[PDB]
């Protein structure tokens, strides 16, 4: 019994393409009525899962859901057990809330022996990626046990400021992504870099302008920054934290390779059937999904995937299915999880729209097509960020996905988590 990661020989999942909806999503985020509504708003979700223990984080805003204020940030971990009718869910076992809510930004979780490290960024100038021209660079680690004890005071919660940073040539590092992986006694966190634009070494001749007649050569170089005349260009990567020493807080930034170099976006690195898989959101001209399995971690080189059917929507400047360099910084985070390696099958919640951010639809794509899909809400329900993680329930693969949707009787976009069972039959 229990819940384990993707290891061993699971049950055979369907492989062919069919239209019969064999997917049965089940909501596991039953919230009480909000009678007496107000201008509430929940954003910046977080969901990590590993070896049967999950985490969660959210920022509750009062007012406009983008330019609002902060009231509370619930960051807590818990176990993953069966509700009883052979349906997995996320049971909470510990909850932590910081005192000042307008300090924590861009958290990142990871699993360890009997803890759950949550690496967040501390800033006193607002959101970092919007005001990075004055950020200090301090990073705070939060440890939350997955099984608290009576009167520990040092086992259920422990924080410490990260002092030493091994930044190679950048200026500031920051955790950027939902979750990471473990390698026995080493922790890895997804992150982004901040390099000076003037100190960037990138020849303006490797831009893929094969068939992009209506474009410009320097679009690749201009797209690496949040703005055309920006002062810092982003760079995805990983943060290494070797906790096997504990002599001094170490921060080792592992930059990504130059293959398909895009702007910095929330990245996710997870384990699947022994080999770690990597994901990177598309907040640049390259609107297609950026999947890939990692073969080398210390020097980060990921074998990308040439998927030409799954992408994310955006604005008019850089809409979906765009494969040409254009100066733009927009998109939505929609990841997936590798459920099989022999056939290289993935599964994730992606949006189905050209220039809007509605209609969240669960979909399973092998490499260049969609096998079976299933919608979660109506064709008009809005959605911004989706986080997908898969696990096992004693004989078979299950996937719990956090999909922010617009509830009818709530009038607020609350992060609701579903539960989809991958079937063992086609049609």
């Amino acid at each position: 019994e229990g819940v384990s990661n993707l290891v061993g020989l699971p049950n055979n999942i369907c492989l062919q393409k069919t239209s019969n909806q064999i997917l049965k999503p089940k909501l596991i985020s039953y919230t009480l009525p909000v009678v007496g509504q107000s201008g509430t708003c929940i954003t910046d979700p977080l969901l990590a899962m590993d070896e049967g223990y999950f985490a969660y984080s959210h920022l509750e805003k009062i007012g406009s859901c983008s330019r609002g204020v902060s009231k509370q940030r619930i960051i807590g971990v818990g176990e993953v057990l069966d509700r009883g009718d052979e349906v997995p869910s996320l049971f909470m076992t510990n909850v932590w809330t910081p005192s000042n809510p307008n300090t924590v930004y861009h958290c990142s979780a990871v699993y360890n022996n009997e803890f759950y490290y949550v690496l967040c960024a501390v800033s006193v100038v607002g959101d970092p990626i919007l005001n990075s021209t004055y950020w200090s660079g301090s990073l705070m680690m939060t440890r939350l046990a997955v099984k608290p004890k009576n009167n520990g005071e040092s086992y259920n919660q422990h924080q410490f400021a990260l002092r030493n940073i091994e930044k190679g040539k950048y200026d500031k590092v920051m955790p950027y992504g939902p979750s990471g992986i473990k390698q026995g006694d080493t922790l890895y966190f997804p992150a982004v870099g901040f390099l000076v634009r003037t100190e960037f070494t990138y020849n303006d001749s490797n831009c893929p302008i094969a068939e992009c007649q209506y474009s410009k050569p320097e679009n690749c170089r201009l797209s690496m920054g949040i703005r055309p005349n920006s002062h810092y260009i982003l760079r995805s990567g990983l943060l290494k934290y070797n906790l096997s020493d504990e002599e001094n807080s170490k921060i080792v930034f592992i930059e990504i390779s130059d293959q398909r170099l895009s702007i910095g976006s929330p990245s996710k690195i997870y384990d699947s059937l022994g080999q770690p898989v990597f994901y990177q959101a598309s907040f640049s001209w390259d609107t297609m999904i950026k999947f890939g399995d990692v073969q080398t971690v210390n020097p980060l080189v990921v074998n990308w995937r040439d998927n030409t059917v799954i992408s994310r929507p955006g604005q008019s400047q850089c809409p979906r299915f765009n494969k040409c360099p254009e100066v733009c910084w927009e998109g939505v985070y929609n990841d997936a999880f590798l459920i099989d390696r022999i056939n290289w099958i993935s599964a994730g919640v992606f949006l189905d729209s050209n220039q809007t951010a509605e209609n969240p639809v669960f979909t399973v794509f092998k490499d260049n097509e969609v096998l079976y899909r299933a919608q979660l809400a109506s064709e008009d329900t809005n959605a911004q960020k989706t986080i997908t993680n898969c696990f096992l329930l004693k004989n078979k693969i299950w996937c719990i996905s956090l999909v922010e949707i617009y509830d009818t009787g709530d009038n607020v976009i609350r992060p609701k988590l579903f539960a989809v069972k991958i079937p063992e039959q086609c049609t």
Epitope: I28, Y56, G78, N150
Partner: nanobody, 119 residues
């Protein structure tokens, strides 16, 4: 289907002592976790207590750290709460669930129970 049956009333003098019970049926109560949650009109969720499976770990909130203590009666499925020395800031509807605070819940909130502390 999981059925949650709340109990306990309200309209008590300030500083009194009430006992809020909540029984359940369906899932095996012997090995799970229970937590009281409350919400006043105008605010959201806030955990009130927490308890483990074998009545080993017990957690509370900073506002009610020393007010009451949760219990467990695994023999006869129940969930008591011996509230003591309540204040006016405790007038809210209490509920029972299977998660500490979260935004979670693996069953529709059945009826709830209101507790009024005033005059």
């Amino acid at each position: 289907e999981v059925q949650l049956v709340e109990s306990g009333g309200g309209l008590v003098q300030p500083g009194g002592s009430l006992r809020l019970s909540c029984a359940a049926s369906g899932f095996t109560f012997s090995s799970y976790a229970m937590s009281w949650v409350r919400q006043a009109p105008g605010k959201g969720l806030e955990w009130v207590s927490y308890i483990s499976s074998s009545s080993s770990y017990t957690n509370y909130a900073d506002s009610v750290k020393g007010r009451f203590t949760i219990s467990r009666d695994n023999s006869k499925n129940t969930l008591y709460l011996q509230m003591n020395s309540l204040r006016a800031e405790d007038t809210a509807s209490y509920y029972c669930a299977r998660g500490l605070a979260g935004v979670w819940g693996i069953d529709v909130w059945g009826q709830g129970t209101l507790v009024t502390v005033s005059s």
